[PDB]
Amino acid sequence: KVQAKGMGFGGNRKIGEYQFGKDLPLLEITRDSSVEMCFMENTDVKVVDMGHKYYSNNKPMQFTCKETPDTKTYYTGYSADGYDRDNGAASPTNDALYAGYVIKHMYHDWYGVEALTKSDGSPMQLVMRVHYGQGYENAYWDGKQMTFGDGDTMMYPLVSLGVGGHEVSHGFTEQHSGLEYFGQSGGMNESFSDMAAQAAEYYSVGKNSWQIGPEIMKEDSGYDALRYMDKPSRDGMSIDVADDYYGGLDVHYSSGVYNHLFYILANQPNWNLRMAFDVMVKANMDYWTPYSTFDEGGCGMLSAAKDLGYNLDDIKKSLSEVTINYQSCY
Ligand SMILES: CC(C)C[C@@H](C(=O)NO)C(=O)Nc1ccc(Cn2cc(CNS(=O)(=O)CC(C)C)nn2)cc1
Ligand SMILES: [Zn+2]
């Protein structure tokens, strides 16, 4: 009913905990005074507390919010203390509301586009389903929303800026190139989402890890990260070059090709992450097709780089390093 601000915590025991309202911005929430209730929703982002179930009516997480001794600001959580603790994270629900804000703003500030749009053309609200399932060690895009488990023994809750950027960006891809979720195109689809994870981190804080999931891997698990973009094969399953691709290799392992490509391109002399992501975003919007092969995708990057005025010999060197062929790209 009215806009309001939320104060509370985020993070986890591995990367550290922080405060919305001190370290990061206050959260944008809503309040209905007729019932003294606040809702983890704003125009752009809604957080659903799945309550460890697999299905929900998708109503926003709602909590009592009342004035206390000293828009209005309220502490988040069902106990009005800023917390929503689960599996070593301070508040996955606060982190998701903030994650959606950052990803929306990255696409707007860097590209002037909506992260998600409806079929009718209008902006589409980012729906973040948190606390999904029991011990669910994954997160995914389902065609209309983003779903995050709370993890288990190997992972903390899967709500971080990078994971949020990854999942939202599956929707961005679906609504642009439409890269299909199998074969080579599916590896490119997964890769673009890993690229967007890096972009979200760089946009927010000016540094990115070149890894996927280090902030959510439990230290006792023995894995520093889920994926490594500098050398995908460090995870024991992903591939570093297109010559190692085979039919049936899962999209989360064939993503190594474009992940490695993105790392290589962003680290060329005179390049950086932003320029590399500008090429990928433009290719996703204007050139890549739903059944793209890795080679056809490299031709789409060359056309995007030409549009942007970037150096095509730097693109070609990067494609060559991941064994993508471009001899037919004319
Ligand atoms: C940061 C991440 C959470 C992002 C997330 C993603 O990309 N979202 O869009 C991702 O990387 N997921 C993912 C990675 C690998 C596989 C391949 N694989 C593993 C297994 C065995 N485990 S399992 O219990 O069967 C399935 C699990 C996953 C429940 N089988 N196939 C499947 C999913
Ligand atoms: Zn994914």
Side-chain angles (χ1 to χ4, degrees):
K1 156 193 193 157
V2 288
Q3 299 185 318
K5 290 293 191 205
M7 183 169 290
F9 302 95
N12 68 39
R13 289 165 183 201
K14 185 165 169 195
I15 61 153
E17 292 185 5
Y18 42 81
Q19 184 189 316
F20 297 105
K22 191 191 306 297
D23 309 297
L24 294 179
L26 281 163
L27 299 168
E28 295 164 356
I29 60 167
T30 45
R31 185 168 191 270
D32 178 358
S33 59
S34 83
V35 286
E36 289 200 293
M37 296 290 179
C38 279
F39 306 87
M40 294 292 287
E41 174 174 24
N42 55 65
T43 294
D44 292 341
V45 186
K46 168 167 62 175
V47 172
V48 176
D49 180 354
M50 297 291 296
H52 298 140
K53 296 182 181 283
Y54 295 88
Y55 305 101
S56 169
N57 61 19
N58 272 6
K59 302 190 164 353
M61 176 163 175
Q62 66 174 42
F63 57 106
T64 292
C65 49
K66 288 198 280 193
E67 295 280 283
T68 68
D70 70 4
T71 56
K72 302 209 169 169
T73 300
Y74 307 84
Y75 273 89
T76 62
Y78 296 128
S79 294
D81 65 357
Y83 288 96
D84 181 14
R85 285 181 180 101
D86 197 294
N87 191 31
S91 180
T93 52
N94 286 352
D95 275 330
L97 189 58
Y98 179 66
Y101 179 96
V102 171
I103 309 306
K104 170 87 190 63
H105 288 252
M106 185 190 74
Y107 278 108
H108 180 263
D109 289 347
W110 280 5
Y111 301 108
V113 297
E114 290 292 343
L116 297 178
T117 62
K118 309 174 145 173
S119 308
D120 84 335
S122 58
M124 173 170 173
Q125 183 181 56
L126 278 64
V127 178
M128 316 283 276
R129 303 195 304 168
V130 181
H131 305 293
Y132 174 85
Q134 204 68 267
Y136 189 74
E137 302 203 298
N138 191 41
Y140 62 91
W141 161 260
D142 74 350
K144 72 185 184 185
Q145 70 210 353
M146 288 75 52
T147 302
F148 307 91
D150 271 339
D152 212 355
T153 66
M154 156 156 81
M155 297 164 175
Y156 289 100
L158 287 310
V159 184
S160 76
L161 284 190
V163 177
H166 178 110
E167 302 306 349
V168 171
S169 293
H170 278 307
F172 184 89
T173 293
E174 182 175 296
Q175 291 175 3
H176 288 90
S177 64
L179 288 163
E180 301 291 11
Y181 205 72
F182 67 95
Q184 291 177 45
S185 62
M188 291 173 61
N189 182 319
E190 264 301 313
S191 296
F192 181 82
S193 280
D194 287 345
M195 305 166 204
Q198 302 304 309
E201 285 180 9
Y202 191 92
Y203 167 83
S204 207
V205 295
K207 54 170 184 219
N208 61 289
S209 64
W210 291 121
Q211 297 178 355
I212 301 294
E215 66 278 12
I216 54 73
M217 299 306 309
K218 296 254 182 104
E219 178 50 60
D220 62 59
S221 79
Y223 306 101
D224 302 346
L226 186 62
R227 288 181 287 274
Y228 304 85
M229 298 185 84
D230 70 312
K231 189 182 172 113
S233 63
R234 287 172 62 185
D235 70 356
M237 323 198 144
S238 293
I239 57 168
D240 295 341
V241 296
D243 282 358
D244 291 338
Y245 175 82
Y246 58 86
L249 181 62
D250 186 73
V251 293
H252 300 93
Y253 307 142
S254 67
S255 60
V257 179
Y258 268 64
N259 281 1
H260 194 198
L261 174 59
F262 181 71
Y263 175 86
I264 290 161
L265 178 60
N267 281 284
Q268 293 291 353
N270 307 312
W271 281 75
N272 53 35
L273 176 150
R274 283 196 69 183
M275 288 172 63
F277 196 58
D278 293 340
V279 171
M280 303 296 195
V281 169
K282 183 170 282 303
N284 200 333
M285 295 179 310
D286 294 343
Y287 294 106
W288 290 342
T289 71
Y291 302 104
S292 188
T293 64
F294 292 146
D295 288 353
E296 283 161 0
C299 196
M301 285 172 69
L302 285 167
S303 294
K306 190 159 166 275
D307 288 346
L308 290 166
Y310 296 163
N311 186 288
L312 300 186
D313 274 355
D314 292 313
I315 299 284
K316 286 174 179 182
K317 183 175 181 163
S318 302
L319 291 176
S320 287
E321 284 184 51
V322 299
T323 76
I324 286 171
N325 183 281
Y326 45 88
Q327 296 186 30
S328 89
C329 299
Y330 287 95

